[PDB]
C-alpha cells in the first residue's frame, strides 16, 4: 500500500527512467549485489565535485537510506529517492 511513491515513479519520463540506470551503473561496475556500498559511492560526490572519506559517504547513505540498510540499491535508489520527490504535494 505504498502506491503514493510507486505511482510517482511513473511520472518519470523514459529519458529520466532509462538514464536512471545510466549513472547507477557507474557505482555498480562489478557489484554482484547490484547496490552501492558507499565504497563505490565516493564517486557520487565526485560527480558533484567532492571527494570526502568513504565513512563520510556512508553518512550520506545513512541520512538518505530510509530502509536503514546502510546501502543504496537500484530499487531503493529508484523508489526511496521518490520519497524526497513526493514531499506532500
Amino acid at each position: 500500500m505504498d502506491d503514493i511513491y510507486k505511482a510517482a515513479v511513473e511520472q518519470l519520463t523514459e529519458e529520466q527512467k532509462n538514464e536512471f540506470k545510466a549513472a547507477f551503473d557507474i557505482f555498480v561496475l562489478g557489484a554482484e549485489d547490484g547496490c552501492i556500498s558507499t565504497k563505490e559511492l565516493g564517486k557520487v560526490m565526485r560527480m558533484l565535485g567532492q571527494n570526502p572519506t568513504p565513512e563520510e559517504l556512508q553518512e550520506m547513505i545513512d541520512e538518505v537510506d530510509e530502509d536503514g540498510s546502510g546501502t543504496v540499491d537500484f530499487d531503493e535508489f529508484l523508489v526511496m529517492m521518490v520519497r524526497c520527490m513526493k514531499d506532500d504535494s
Binding site: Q16, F20, A22, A23, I26, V44, M47, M81, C84, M85
Partner: peptide
Amino acid sequence: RISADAMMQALLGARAK
C-alpha cells in the same frame, strides 16, 4: 530525481562509445 539531477550530467567521461 531528488533534485536537479546531477546524475544525468554525472557521466562526464566514457569509454567504448
